Amino acid sequence: GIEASLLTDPKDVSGRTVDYIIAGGGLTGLTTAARLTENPNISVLVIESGSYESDRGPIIEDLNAYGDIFGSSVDHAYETVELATNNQTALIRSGNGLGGSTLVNGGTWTRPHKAQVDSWETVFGNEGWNWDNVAAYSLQAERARAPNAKQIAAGHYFNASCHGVNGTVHAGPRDTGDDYSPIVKALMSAVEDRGVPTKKDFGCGDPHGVSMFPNTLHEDQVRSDAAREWLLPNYQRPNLQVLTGQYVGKVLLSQNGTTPRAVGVEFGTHKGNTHNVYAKHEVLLAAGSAVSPTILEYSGIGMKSILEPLGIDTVVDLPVGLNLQDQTTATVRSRITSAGAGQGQAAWFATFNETFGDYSEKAHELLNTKLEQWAEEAVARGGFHNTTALLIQYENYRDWIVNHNVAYSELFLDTAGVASFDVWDLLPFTRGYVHILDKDPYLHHFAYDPQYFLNELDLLGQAAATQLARNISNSGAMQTYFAGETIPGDNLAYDADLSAWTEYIPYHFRPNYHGVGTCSMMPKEMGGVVDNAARVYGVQGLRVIDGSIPPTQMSSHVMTVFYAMALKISDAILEDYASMQ
Numbered sequence: 001g002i003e004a005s006l007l008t009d010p011k012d013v014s015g016r017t018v019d020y021i022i023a024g025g026g027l028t029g030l031t032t033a034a035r036l037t038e039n040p041n042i043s044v045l046v047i048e049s050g051s052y053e054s055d056r057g058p059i060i061e062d063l064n065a066y067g068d069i070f071g072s073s074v075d076h077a078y079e080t081v082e083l084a085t086n087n088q089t090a091l092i093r094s095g096n097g098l099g100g101s102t103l104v105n106g107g108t109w110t111r112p113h114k115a116q117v118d119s120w121e122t123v124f125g126n127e128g129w130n131w132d133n134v135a136a137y138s139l140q141a142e143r144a145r146a147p148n149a150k151q152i153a154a155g156h157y158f159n160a161s162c163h164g165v166n167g168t169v170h171a172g173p174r175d176t177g178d179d180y181s182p183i184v185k186a187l188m189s190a191v192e193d194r195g196v197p198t199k200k201d202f203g204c205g206d207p208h209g210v211s212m213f214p215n216t217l218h219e220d221q222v223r224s225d226a227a228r229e230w231l232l233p234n235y236q237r238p239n240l241q242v243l244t245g246q247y248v249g250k251v252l253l254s255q256n257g258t259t260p261r262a263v264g265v266e267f268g269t270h271k272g273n274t275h276n277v278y279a280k281h282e283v284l285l286a287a288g289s290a291v292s293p294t295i296l297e298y299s300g301i302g303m304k305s306i307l308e309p310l311g312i313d314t315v316v317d318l319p320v321g322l323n324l325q326d327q328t329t330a331t332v333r334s335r336i337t338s339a340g341a342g343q344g345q346a347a348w349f350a351t352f353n354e355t356f357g358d359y360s361e362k363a364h365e366l367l368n369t370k371l372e373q374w375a376e377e378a379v380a381r382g383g384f385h386n387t388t389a390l391l392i393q394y395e396n397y398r399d400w401i402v403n404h405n406v407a408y409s410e411l412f413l414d415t416a417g418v419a420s421f422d423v424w425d426l427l428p429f430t431r432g433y434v435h436i437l438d439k440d441p442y443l444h445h446f447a448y449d450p451q452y453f454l455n456e457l458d459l460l461g462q463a464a465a466t467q468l469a470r471n472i473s474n475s476g477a478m479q480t481y482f483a484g485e486t487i488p489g490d491n492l493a494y495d496a497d498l499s500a501w502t503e504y505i506p507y508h509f510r511p512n513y514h515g516v517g518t519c520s521m522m523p524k525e526m527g528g529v530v531d532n533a534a535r536v537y538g539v540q541g542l543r544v545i546d547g548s549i550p551p552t553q554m555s556s557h558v559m560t561v562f563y564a565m566a567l568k569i570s571d572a573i574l575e576d577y578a579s580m581q
């Protein structure tokens, strides 16, 4: 069985050499491990802090149990700094175990807007990283099931041209067995009355309007976590080894040559009892966006101003840990009538003007005139180091909004007994950072600061989007099922205006846990940490291959893109393997 195959004893790899070491057995780590070990000549060692959780039971396997796992050993629960917006510490839910956050996520499977991925090539200089190519890889990774009559009647629409059916990640409609709630179609009707589209397939490249979507689960409804999809079918490969229960602390570097070279990693759980393992080809960091950048800093790769005070010698100076981009989420929940009973989720990917409504003109005026001021302010807060380069990101977002009308906010609807919306501004302008606060990796002492709501448009956009969810919950066809609001409920007057919502939101939000950008894939001159093959600048044999690298957020759930990203980087790694013989 798979459990018996896992390594737990450090002595089983201490001092040994393998071709590739992957730090982190999460979404990108396991996808990459599977792709690389297809060649029997290539030995891979995945080092994961957690262990196998896929067969534990409903708390992991049933998507409807979402959230029950929070606070447990399968949740890293990274704590942020005391946030300036509300003087409180927030918790960043992040999966701890083989499969990473795919063990604890909502399972939502959607793709971003074509123009967003295209800009990774045209604005962020990543040759080959455009919608056509990334989408091709995403379809390659996908194994989707079309909806049946019951699911179609509920509101599903599936364009076969936009989905892979021969891939690895099992995806299809969530179906608990009971009737689907008529509230999903009621929401579609409510937005149709406003001229908003409905039933677009959110995997086709223009996510806009209200639609249902596939989920990452098998037909029997078992969660398609990355370990179940990429490791379980392949664990008997002799060349694939997985060490659990250990943290990679830092990358071992040789500076005896021209350019520093990653020769292995140090791992363990506490200072003073560590172990080294070596890589003949490369070290690949896939510990997640909150951690890969710290592994770099502990190794001497990061900003001298950060490393020197901690006693760490700066081997390669790069803006590691900056450009952190996570979203803010708030909730609107209402009681429903029994007529609205049934299962079902849907989401409104709302454009900038749909989000702001009659405040659209004023919001556009800010978007048009405040970009330089915002960039200077974010740099002064330490969210980024180069103002001009940040301004380019902001103008890219403006171009997405004004020239491509991409979705700006997401209003995610859960039913199953209530009408509940989790709402988030998809494109935050704030930029945060993560930096280590000690030289010892095993102390796990770091400052993770997303700087939520420190940009004024992010506060206005979140407030407008959440106000919209309240509005639509009692608009048009939705009025029928409305049986009273419970959240905010008594906590915010029902007729509250936009200003009132902006005062309420800082005290009633949670991180969205979609953090990206801490090792941004963009040119060094634009503040990047990795090139278009995910290679860390100035270091040989070292890559960052996880959610740390996307240089922008996107109007979608990220799994479809991260699986594609891992497969694309895997190909680049294999091309270099052939060049290093």
Ligand SMILES: *[C@@H]1O[C@H](CO)[C@@H](O[C@@H]2O[C@H](CO)[C@@H](O[C@@H]3O[C@H](CO)[C@@H](O)[C@H](O[C@H]4O[C@H](CO)[C@@H](O)[C@H](O)[C@@H]4O[C@H]4O[C@H](CO)[C@@H](O)[C@H](O)[C@@H]4O)[C@@H]3O)[C@H](O)[C@H]2NC(C)=O)[C@H](O)[C@H]1NC(C)=O
Pocket (backbone or CB within 6 Å): 084, 085, 086, 087
């Ligand atoms: C997060 O926490 C930090 C603190 O850790 C908060 O930052 C501090 O915020 C306070 C204000 O809340 C600020 O203190 C003021 O500093 C001013 C000097 O720069 C003072 O002039 C001011 O004094 C007035 O208000 C006091 C408090 O009521 C009175 O005791 C004092 O006598 C002064 O009173 C005059 O002004 C008030 C109107 O404010 C008026 O009613 C009176 O009639 C009179 O005219 C404060 O002491 C700190 O400087 C901030 N920073 C620090 C490091 O302490 C931050 O705001 C918090 N964030 C959130 C979101 O809550």
Ligand SMILES: Cc1cc2nc3c(=O)[nH]c(=O)nc-3n(C[C@H](O)[C@H](O)[C@H](O)COP(=O)(O)OP(=O)(O)OC[C@H]3O[C@@H](n4cnc5c(N)ncnc54)[C@H](O)[C@@H]3O)c2cc1C
Pocket (backbone or CB within 6 Å): 023, 024, 025, 026, 027, 028, 029, 047, 048, 049, 050, 093, 094, 095, 096, 097, 098, 099, 100, 101, 102, 104, 105, 106, 107, 108, 109, 110, 246, 247, 248, 249, 286, 287, 288, 289, 291, 512, 513, 514, 546, 547, 548, 557, 558, 559, 560, 562
């Ligand atoms: C609560 C929540 C809900 C989400 N909902 C959705 C959704 O509905 N749809 C969607 O598409 N996406 C969703 N996501 C996001 C998606 O799951 C993540 O973006 C994705 O898993 C990130 O992949 P990754 O490879 O970068 O990191 P991860 O998958 O987080 O994997 C990193 C791995 O590194 C391990 N690790 C950490 N530190 C170390 C160390 N020092 N050494 C060794 N191993 C280490 C971790 O335990 C983990 O297994 C959600 C995420 C969260 C947290």
Ligand SMILES: *[C@@H]1O[C@H](CO)[C@@H](O)[C@H](O)[C@H]1NC(C)=O
Pocket (backbone or CB within 6 Å): 159, 160, 161, 162, 204
């Ligand atoms: C399905 O998707 C393909 C590719 O995007 C597109 O050409 C086609 O028009 C779509 N069909 C429908 C009915 O939307």
Ligand SMILES: *[C@@H]1O[C@H](CO)[C@@H](O)[C@H](O)[C@H]1NC(C)=O
Pocket (backbone or CB within 6 Å): 353, 360, 361, 364, 405
């Ligand atoms: C959004 O509103 C602004 C300001 O009224 C307008 O200029 C712009 O064209 C609108 N865009 C769309 C897609 O309606």
Ligand SMILES: *[C@@H]1O[C@H](CO)[C@@H](O)[C@H](O)[C@H]1NC(C)=O
Pocket (backbone or CB within 6 Å): 386, 387, 388, 389, 392, 524, 525, 526, 527
């Ligand atoms: C700052 O960013 C801009 C825009 O990408 C770039 O032209 C410039 O070279 C960067 N500055 C430095 C000092 O690298």
Ligand SMILES: [Cl-]
Pocket (backbone or CB within 6 Å): 170, 217, 218, 219, 220
């Ligand atoms: Cl299946």
